[PDB]
Amino acid sequence: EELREIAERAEADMREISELAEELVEDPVYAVAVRGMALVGAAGVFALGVGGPPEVLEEARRRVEEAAREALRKYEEGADVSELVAELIRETSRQIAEIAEATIKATDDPEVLEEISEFAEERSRRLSEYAERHVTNPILAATVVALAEVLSAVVRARSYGAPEEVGEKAVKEVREASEEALERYKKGEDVSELVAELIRETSRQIAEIAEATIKATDDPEVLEEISEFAEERSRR
Amino acid sequence: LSEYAERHVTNPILAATVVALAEVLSAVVRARSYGAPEEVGEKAVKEVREASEEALERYKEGADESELVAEVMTATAEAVGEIAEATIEATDDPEKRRKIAEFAREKMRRIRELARKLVEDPVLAAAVAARALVLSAAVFAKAYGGPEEYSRLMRRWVEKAAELARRARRLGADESVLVAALMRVAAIAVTAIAMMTVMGVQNAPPEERERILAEATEMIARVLAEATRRVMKRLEDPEAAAELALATIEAITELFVDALEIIRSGEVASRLAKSGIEVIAELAEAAIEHIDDPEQLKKIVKKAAEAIKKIVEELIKKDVEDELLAEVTSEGNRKLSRITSKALTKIKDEKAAAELTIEAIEAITENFLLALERIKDGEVAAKLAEDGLLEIYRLAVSGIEHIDNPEELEKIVKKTEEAVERIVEALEKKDVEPELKEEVEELGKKLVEIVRKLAERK
């Protein structure tokens, strides 16, 4: 049990380091990279405490470091700040989602599952807020938010055994939609239309995923919880 | 009392010394809890006071109050941590140990929060914060009884990062890169210590636990290495650039030497060596890209050769699979070849060219002597031997093309044959299948011929 006590202070320390760098720094790209690496580096402690796969965690950390190197190389080249920030955020998003997806497999216990879900939800909400604060390009911000929300929906769906393809299809559609939004932006299309299309596709995607989850379920109180979660997602 | 001082004292150095006195004395009061030797508190107090007096004198000499503040707070954090850890040693009670550790964490938090306001220099402020956070994590980690060597090594890493940061601040670099370096390495260190603690609680086997240290040392080293070249690319002074290159190379080499000494598993050590060789080679090549006087270039080459040999020698001391060892030392040697070739392209006079060509030829020859001294099987030794003969050929001819005149060329004409003969003769003393041995000696008889024919072509 007490391993949770260890992980708590470890994570708090990592967050403090992130904040200190955020205030002390004087260059946006470096600040983004610092926080990006710190958050993922921290999450591994919680994953390890639950008994997650160690090799997967190490690989995820390596991937985060590689993303940071790529972004630093681009910024030294004088590349656009917006693209680099979006790339770093998206890489962190997939990495953290992968860690959560590995952790979800560790055990059948509802209690551990609830703990994992809560951890993932808190991290996702904080990340969405931070990205909304940093990214200036409208389409980039919108797509970041949509990707985060969709990933959170998939994470929740895992807790009830819903089909994985029900999530994968929405992820593919969302990736196609974000690529389409970037293409329309490059095509000179009106921004408002791109944002509307993105949000509408995201809405239908999350709706379909949640509906499939509700169909797959057979527990009343589980259905009530799913309804509450769907309401929260729609509100956001 | 410290609050009043920090609120109302008008001078930064005076405030720093005031809060340092308050914090040290309050740490002593905390230490009074459980009978730990009073001499420890006396020593910490005396160190704090003498350092404060020295800083005040330097300020009276016109030195920067910011540097004095950073030094004073560094000493304060060190003293608080040392006292708390010694208190942790004075008892066997688990609950007492974790309570003491929580109080020590609170103290570290307080000292760090106090530091962030007083320190005006962004780089020094970042460094102080990193120092405090690292020491806090380590002092806490001791509570559960993990080996102290790992914590000491992590402290050493943090300290080396701080040393590099202060050196670059003296160099006058852009503050953003340095702040990123400090905070990034601090995060890596903190998460590494936490992960090790987690493994300890889980009661993992040491063959598993060691892996995390290798994972951490690689990233930390590469993280500092990457920062070095970013900073160096914006400098303009040759002496300063060479100083940065040599200093960082030496520091990274020392850290890897320590880590390789500590770790105690085969595959982990193999991978760690494989990564470290590349890290140092890349840093050396990056430094070599910038111009220098011939002697400055020669010093850079000499340092790199010393480092790669030193690491390889370290691995030789360790039990490890024969084939993996051969690949490691063969692969390492190839890196020396490349940097030797890259450096040779920049020279413009025979004296340096001949000296470097001979030096690398000897160095590359030497390493194989050690590897062959412990190879476990004939086939593994043979393959490594063939590669060695081929390697020295590439070094020889690659130099020959740039060589100026026969009066110089005679030295390589002699030394290449000498090296080939030494390698072949040393390989002849080992036990191996005669048919393979004949082939190996045949290749030696072959390669020297072309070297002589190319040399004959003035």
Author numbering:
A (entry chain Z): 2 to 237
B (entry chain V): 238 to 695
Quote what the paper states about this structure:
Here we describe extendable linear, curved and angled protein building blocks, as well as inter-block interactions, that conform to specified geometric standards; assemblies designed using these blocks inherit their extendability and regular interaction surfaces, enabling them to be expanded or contracted by varying the number of modules, and reinforced with secondary struts. We construct twistless helix repeat (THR) protein blocks from identical straight α-helices (typically 2–4 helices in each unit); the length of the blocks can be varied simply by varying the number of repeat units. Restricting helical geometry to ideal straight helices with zero helical twist in principle considerably limits what types of structure could be built, but this is more than compensated by the great simplification of downstream material design, as illustrated below. Using X-ray crystallography and electron microscopy, we validate nanomaterial designs ranging from simple polygonal and circular oligomers that can be concentrically nested, up to large polyhedral nanocages and unbounded straight ‘train track’ assemblies with reconfigurable sizes and geometries that can be readily blueprinted.
To generate expandable nanocages, flat cyclic components that form the faces of the cages were linked through noncovalent handshake interactions at the specified angle. For the flat cyclic component, we used a ring design with 12 repeats (R12B) constructed from curve units, and split the 12 repeats into either 3 subunits with 4 repeats each (C3) or 4 subunits with 3 repeats each (C4), depending on the desired polyhedral symmetry architecture. We then fused linear THR arms onto each subunit constrained to point outward parallel to a radial vector emanating from the symmetry axis, but offset such that when the C2 interface is formed, the C2 axis is along a radial vector. For tetrahedra (T3), octahedra (O3) and icosahedra (I3) built from flat C3-symmetric objects, the out-of-plane handshake angles that are needed to join the flat objects are 70.5°, 109.5° and 138.2°, respectively. Tetrahedral, octahedral ‘cubic’ and icosahedral structures with C3 rings at respective axes (T3, O3 and I3), and octahedral structures with C4 rings at the respective axes (O4) were constructed by incorporation of the appropriate C2 interface. Designed geometric features including the spindle-like twofold handshake interface and the flat ‘in-plane’ ring areas with distinct holes are clearly evident.
